Amino acid sequence: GPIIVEPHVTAVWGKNVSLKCLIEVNETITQISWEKIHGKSSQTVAVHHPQYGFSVQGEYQGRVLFKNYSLNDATITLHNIGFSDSGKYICKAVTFPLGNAQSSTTVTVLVEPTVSLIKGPDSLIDGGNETVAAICIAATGKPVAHIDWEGDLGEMESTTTSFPNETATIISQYKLFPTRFARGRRITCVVKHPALEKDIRYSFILDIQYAPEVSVTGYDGNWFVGRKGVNLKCNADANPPPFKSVWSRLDGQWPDGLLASDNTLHFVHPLTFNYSGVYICKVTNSLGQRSDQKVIYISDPP
Amino acid sequence: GPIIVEPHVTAVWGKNVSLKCLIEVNETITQISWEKIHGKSSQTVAVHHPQYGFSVQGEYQGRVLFKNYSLNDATITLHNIGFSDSGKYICKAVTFPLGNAQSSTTVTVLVEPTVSLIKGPDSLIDGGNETVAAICIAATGKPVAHIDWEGDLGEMESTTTSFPNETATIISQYKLFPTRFARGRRITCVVKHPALEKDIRYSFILDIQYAPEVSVTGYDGNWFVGRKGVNLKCNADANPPPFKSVWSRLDGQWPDGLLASDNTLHFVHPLTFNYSGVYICKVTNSLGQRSDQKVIYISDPP
Numbered sequence: 286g287p288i289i290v291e292p293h294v295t296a297v298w299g300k301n302v303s304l305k306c307l308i309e310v311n312e313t314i315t316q317i318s319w320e321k322i323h324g325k326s327s328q329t330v331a332v333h334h335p336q337y338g339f340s341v342q343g344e345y346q347g348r349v350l351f352k353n354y355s356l357n358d359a360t361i362t363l364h365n366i367g368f369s370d371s372g373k374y375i376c377k378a379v380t381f382p383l384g385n386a387q388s389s390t391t392v393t394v395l396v397e398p399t400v401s402l403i404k405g406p407d408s409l410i411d412g413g414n415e416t417v418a419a420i421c422i423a424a425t426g427k428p429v430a431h432i433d434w435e436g437d438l439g440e441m442e443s444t445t446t447s448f449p450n451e452t453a454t455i456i457s458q459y460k461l462f463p464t465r466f467a468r469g470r471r472i473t474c475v476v477k478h479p480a481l482e483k484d485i486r487y488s489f490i491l492d493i494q495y496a497p498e499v500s501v502t503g504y505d506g507n508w509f510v511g512r513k514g515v516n517l518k519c520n521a522d523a524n525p526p527p528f529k530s531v532w533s534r535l536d537g538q539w540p541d542g543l544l545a546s547d548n549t550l551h552f553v554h555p556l557t558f559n560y561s562g563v564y565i566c567k568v569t570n571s572l573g574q575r576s577d578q579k580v581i582y583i584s585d586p587p
Numbered sequence: 588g589p590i591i592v593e594p595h596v597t598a599v600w601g602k603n604v605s606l607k608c609l610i611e612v613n614e615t616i617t618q619i620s621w622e623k624i625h626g627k628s629s630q631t632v633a634v635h636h637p638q639y640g641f642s643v644q645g646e647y648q649g650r651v652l653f654k655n656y657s658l659n660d661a662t663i664t665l666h667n668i669g670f671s672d673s674g675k676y677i678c679k680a681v682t683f684p685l686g687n688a689q690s691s692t693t694v695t696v697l698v699e700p701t702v703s704l705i706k707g708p709d710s711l712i713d714g715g716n717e718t719v720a721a722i723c724i725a726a727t728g729k730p731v732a733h734i735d736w737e738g739d740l741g742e743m744e745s746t747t748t749s750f751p752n753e754t755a756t757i758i759s760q761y762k763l764f765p766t767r768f769a770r771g772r773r774i775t776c777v778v779k780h781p782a783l784e785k786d787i788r789y790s791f792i793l794d795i796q797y798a799p800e801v802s803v804t805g806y807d808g809n810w811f812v813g814r815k816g817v818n819l820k821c822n823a824d825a826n827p828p829p830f831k832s833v834w835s836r837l838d839g840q841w842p843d844g845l846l847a848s849d850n851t852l853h854f855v856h857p858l859t860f861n862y863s864g865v866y867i868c869k870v871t872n873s874l875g876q877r878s879d880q881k882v883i884y885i886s887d888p889p
């Protein structure tokens with residue numbers, strides 16, 4: 286076309302926008318205008334003369350600048366978009382003598398959301414009813430921002446409310462039946478929105494609590510009378526960390542010749558036909574006490 | 588209005604026309620255009636710059652001039668109208684920085700007729716069937732010229748044929764039962780047409796022929812024997828003029844003591860009891876012979 290401009294542009298709230306316009310005609314140029322039309326009425330915006338400088342109209346006076354001082358780039362950046370810039374703007378080029386041609390660009394206003402991740406309120410213990418683990422918030426976005434979680438470990442869901450301003454807020458609530466096998470999993474809501482030159486992401490690790498989980502190693506196949514220096518450790522994974530890890534013998538009695546370094550159980554005396562009892566360590570955290578036992582047998586070969 | 592121009596103007600074929608346009612705005616002016624639009628396409632006509640002179644477009648190049656060298660009278664005379672100037676022309680004023688406003692004027696083409704009066708072909712004798720006395724011709728007028736006769740002495744009538752060119756010719760035939768009492772009457776067709784700043788008229792006198800019309804004066808009440816020096820003139824009005832005006836006595840006989848000076852009849856001898864006859868002069872023209880007589884009586888008192 287005689288005047289080439291890109292149409293259907295989109296400008297971001299509060300930020301600026303470059304309204305490119307170029308006029309490569311072997312014709313000699315005498316005036317250069319920009320006009321936003323309110324309906325059938327043409328409010329002028331910017332004007333460039335080769336003799337009588339520039340002109341910027343009220344109320345655009347502060348918020349428009351000419352990117353090029355040449356008679357050829359009608360290119361202008363509109364400083365600081367508001368809502369009311371949503372319309373059709375035409376670039377009027379006056380030549381001598383063809384008259385004037387015009388090209389239009391329709392700019393739609395577009396406002397960013399502001400995102401937030403918020404820890405769901407109830408704590409996530411093991412094997413309990415569905416719980417809300419996290420809420421992702423895309424605030425006052427126009428158009429409605431969009432949302433998506435990457436965990437495939439539970440269920441998305443969202444309620445979205447919209448405004449007079451012709452923007453909206455959606456809130457995605459991520460929920461799961463919590464299991465300890467999901468300890469420290471990365472939950473992450475991505476939010477995709479037109480005005481996001483690169484979509485924005487917010488991340489989480491799951492903190493699932495659970496009851497203690499205990500397992501004593503130490504007893505290999507057979508323990509023979511007089512075997513010297515063998516142990517039992519009360520290995521246990523729990524969250525929160527536990528506090529109590531008492532090392533009781535189920536047969537109420539408890540012989541000497543034992544000690545409980547760390548939570549290992551030492552038999553610092555060589556083995557006797559004593560000791561022949563079912564040993565049980567009992568580990569306790571915020572969520573309660575759990576225990577495991579190893580049936581200890583002392584034997585002797587021919 | 589911002590730009591004041593007169594609308595719905597009418598331009599006369601072959602002649603010129605002034606397209607007035609004036610732009611009294613306290614705004615400073617930067618370009619001045621005239622554009623005839625063919626449908627939705629704007630062929631520029633004239634352009635005025637305060638720096639880079641004038642411009643006249645093809646093919647208007649010869650036929651347009653700027654009536655005012657000022658930046659304020661877009662007034663132009665379009666030299667030599669043809670048919671194809673029948674349309675809407677707009678005057679474009681470019682200011683700095685309002686942009687541009689425009690006012691339109693719709694010029695309809697209008698061609699003069701050319702008028703003629705032509706003597707109807709058959710001659711007008713007296714008391715004959717209606718005859719066509721004159722034909723008035725309004726030729727190739729656009730729109731159809733109009734016609735009217737002023738004589739109230741017969742009947743108008745007209746046949747009007749129209750053309751491709753979107754002009755027409757009407758021919759009014761004026762007809763009457765001709766009577767001699769209408770000799771030398773002014774018949775006149777007026778032709779009224781939009782393009783005639785003062786309507787045009789063509790005039791005629793009627794030339795009605797007639798048979799001769801005769802009347803002898805001379806005989807007063809009584810003529811007495813011996814009365815000295817009395818005459819009879821053969822007064823007669825006819826058209827065409829007559830040629831023969833013989834002065835015969837109906838009683839075949841014709842005494843001496845008479846003479847026919849001019850067409851008076853002298854009795855140069857004092858009256859006798861002769862002369863006592865019915866005297867008749869016979870007048871003859873193109874249309875034939877007519878006559879009148881006076882019964883002459885000579886008497887004598889006691």
Ligand SMILES: *[C@@H]1O[C@H](CO[C@@H]2O[C@@H](C)[C@@H](O)[C@@H](O)[C@@H]2O)[C@@H](O[C@@H]2O[C@H](CO)[C@@H](O[C@@H]3O[C@H](CO[C@H]4O[C@H](CO)[C@@H](O)[C@H](O)[C@@H]4O)[C@@H](O)[C@H](O[C@H]4O[C@H](CO)[C@@H](O)[C@H](O)[C@@H]4O)[C@@H]3O)[C@H](O)[C@H]2NC(C)=O)[C@H](O)[C@H]1NC(C)=O
Pocket residue numbers: 414415416417460
């Ligand atoms: C296990 O969790 C189950 C789901 O709970 C979830 O997890 C929690 C932590 C949150 O994250 C929450 O968002 C999750 O949904 C839970 O099962 C649920 O039990 C409750 C009842 O105790 C149900 O709520 C009731 O829902 C009905 C729905 O009625 C219909 O219409 C509504 C629209 O209004 C639709 O949305 C529904 O699909 C239905 O078609 C309500 O009518 C009802 O309202 C009541 O309270 C109002 C108060 O004004 C009264 O006026 C009414 O008369 C009712 O009494 C309840 O809100 C819930 O729907 C149900 N299932 C689900 C899938 O949510 C279960 O309790 C947990 N297991 C336990 C505790 O053992």
Ligand SMILES: *[C@@H]1O[C@H](CO[C@@H]2O[C@@H](C)[C@@H](O)[C@@H](O)[C@@H]2O)[C@@H](O[C@@H]2O[C@H](CO)[C@@H](O[C@@H]3O[C@H](CO[C@H]4O[C@H](CO)[C@@H](O)[C@H](O)[C@@H]4O)[C@@H](O)[C@H](O[C@H]4O[C@H](CO)[C@@H](O)[C@H](O)[C@@H]4O)[C@@H]3O)[C@H](O)[C@H]2NC(C)=O)[C@H](O)[C@H]1NC(C)=O
Pocket residue numbers: 716717718719762
């Ligand atoms: C006295 O003058 C009378 C009128 O003549 C006028 O004066 C002359 C000098 C011219 O200026 C002339 O323009 C004036 O009109 C005259 O009376 C007329 O006599 C003739 C016949 O001798 C009539 O002509 C005939 O008219 C008829 C009309 O028929 C109808 O249709 C036509 C349309 O076609 C209408 O216009 C009429 O109103 C009727 O409704 C014709 O049909 C006819 O055509 C004939 O000739 C063609 C030749 O192809 C044949 O095909 C047909 O068969 C016909 O034979 C005639 O043309 C005339 O109308 C009539 N009256 C008037 C008012 O004109 C009269 O003769 C004179 N007195 C004398 C000579 O003693």
Ligand SMILES: *[C@@H]1O[C@H](CO)[C@@H](O[C@@H]2O[C@H](CO)[C@@H](O[C@@H]3O[C@H](CO[C@H]4O[C@H](CO)[C@@H](O)[C@H](O)[C@@H]4O)[C@@H](O)[C@H](O[C@H]4O[C@H](CO)[C@@H](O)[C@H](O)[C@@H]4O)[C@@H]3O)[C@H](O)[C@H]2NC(C)=O)[C@H](O)[C@H]1NC(C)=O
Pocket residue numbers: 300301364365
């Ligand atoms: C879209 O367009 C907008 C604005 O057109 C751009 O954002 C602009 O960013 C500039 C640069 O930061 C802003 O101008 C800055 O103003 C600062 C504040 O001025 C002072 O006012 C008085 C001065 O006495 C005091 O209150 C105080 O000193 C304030 O600072 C200046 O400080 C900045 O000066 C800078 O330049 C000078 C010149 O060398 C340096 O000496 C300084 O170190 C400093 O770098 C500057 O002038 C402007 O206000 C912003 N406009 C806004 C907010 O709308 C966007 O960047 C642009 N967007 C894109 C993507 O292009």
Ligand SMILES: *[C@@H]1O[C@H](CO)[C@@H](O[C@@H]2O[C@H](CO)[C@@H](O[C@@H]3O[C@H](CO[C@H]4O[C@H](CO)[C@@H](O)[C@H](O)[C@@H]4O)[C@@H](O)[C@H](O[C@H]4O[C@H](CO)[C@@H](O)[C@H](O)[C@@H]4O)[C@@H]3O)[C@H](O)[C@H]2NC(C)=O)[C@H](O)[C@H]1NC(C)=O
Pocket residue numbers: 298396424425448450452454
């Ligand atoms: C179209 O329509 C919607 C709905 O009306 C607008 O959304 C509102 O936007 C404004 C501004 O973004 C929001 O108002 C802000 O509230 C903040 C909350 O402050 C705290 O205290 C409140 C209690 O009242 C708590 O709820 C909250 O958690 C916070 O702890 C204020 O901090 C903001 O004020 C800030 O700016 C001012 C001026 O610069 C400073 O003086 C302050 O110090 C502070 O920094 C502000 O008032 C409002 O909450 C939004 N409503 C929503 C999201 O529902 C959209 O703005 C509008 N869209 C467009 C594009 O204009």
Ligand SMILES: *[C@@H]1O[C@H](CO)[C@@H](O[C@@H]2O[C@H](CO)[C@@H](O[C@@H]3O[C@H](CO[C@H]4O[C@H](CO)[C@@H](O)[C@H](O)[C@@H]4O)[C@@H](O)[C@H](O[C@H]4O[C@H](CO)[C@@H](O)[C@H](O)[C@@H]4O)[C@@H]3O)[C@H](O)[C@H]2NC(C)=O)[C@H](O)[C@H]1NC(C)=O
Pocket residue numbers: 602603666667
């Ligand atoms: C609408 O506009 C039209 C034209 O624009 C007007 O009509 C014009 O009338 C002018 C004046 O008569 C015409 O121009 C005249 O041309 C004549 C012919 O030029 C010569 O060409 C060569 C020269 O060597 C020879 O064949 C021969 O000499 C021809 O004459 C000139 O003779 C005229 O000269 C006159 O001015 C000079 C200057 O002083 C005098 O010395 C002379 O004595 C003489 O007066 C003259 O230049 C023009 O052609 C017409 N245009 C046409 C026909 O379209 C209408 O009047 C106007 N209508 C209205 C109502 O405004």
Ligand SMILES: *[C@@H]1O[C@H](CO)[C@@H](O[C@@H]2O[C@H](CO)[C@@H](O[C@@H]3O[C@H](CO[C@H]4O[C@H](CO)[C@@H](O)[C@H](O)[C@@H]4O)[C@@H](O)[C@H](O[C@H]4O[C@H](CO)[C@@H](O)[C@H](O)[C@@H]4O)[C@@H]3O)[C@H](O)[C@H]2NC(C)=O)[C@H](O)[C@H]1NC(C)=O
Pocket residue numbers: 600698726727750752754756
């Ligand atoms: C739209 O349409 C109509 C219909 O076609 C046009 O009307 C014609 O117009 C032209 C020009 O006016 C007329 O043609 C002229 O004829 C004249 C007649 O000359 C004599 O000889 C003829 C025999 O052929 C006799 O019938 C007649 O009585 C004359 O005795 C010519 O003299 C004209 O030529 C003249 O100009 C040329 C060039 O300048 C010179 O060289 C000559 O010497 C001479 O001066 C001319 O040819 C024609 O008769 C019209 N037809 C009609 C009236 O039915 C309209 O012109 C048109 N309308 C418009 C606005 O353009």
Ligand SMILES: *[C@@H]1O[C@H](CO)[C@@H](O[C@@H]2O[C@H](CO)[C@@H](O[C@@H]3O[C@H](CO)[C@@H](O)[C@H](O)[C@@H]3O)[C@H](O)[C@H]2NC(C)=O)[C@H](O)[C@H]1NC(C)=O
Pocket residue numbers: 352353354355358
């Ligand atoms: C205002 O607009 C003009 C014209 O659009 C911009 O012109 C830049 O001018 C330079 C030099 O005149 C052009 O680059 C040339 O590239 C050759 C490489 O062969 C180099 O040798 C020259 O030195 C020169 O750099 C360039 O085409 C042109 N840029 C554009 C986008 O057209 C100018 O940048 C603009 N000014 C401002 C302040 O924005």
Ligand SMILES: *[C@@H]1O[C@H](CO)[C@@H](O[C@@H]2O[C@H](CO)[C@@H](O[C@@H]3O[C@H](CO)[C@@H](O)[C@H](O)[C@@H]3O)[C@H](O)[C@H]2NC(C)=O)[C@H](O)[C@H]1NC(C)=O
Pocket residue numbers: 654655656657660
């Ligand atoms: C071109 O257009 C101009 C402006 O329309 C025409 O201006 C004529 O200029 C004269 C003098 O400048 C004006 O008349 C003034 O009248 C007073 C009477 O008080 C007299 O004292 C001055 O000497 C002068 O004559 C007049 O207003 C103006 N005419 C019009 C129609 O506006 C000018 O005539 C045009 N030029 C040509 C060549 O057509």
Ligand SMILES: *[C@@H]1O[C@H](CO)[C@@H](O)[C@H](O)[C@H]1NC(C)=O
Pocket residue numbers: 540557558559
């Ligand atoms: C085992 O220890 C107990 C202490 O309760 C002691 O009375 C008993 O004699 C011991 N038995 C053996 C075989 O060492």
Ligand SMILES: *[C@@H]1O[C@H](CO)[C@@H](O)[C@H](O)[C@H]1NC(C)=O
Pocket residue numbers: 842859860861
């Ligand atoms: C009248 O004149 C005639 C000539 O024809 C003549 O014979 C006669 O005598 C005259 N009569 C009188 C009274 O004069």
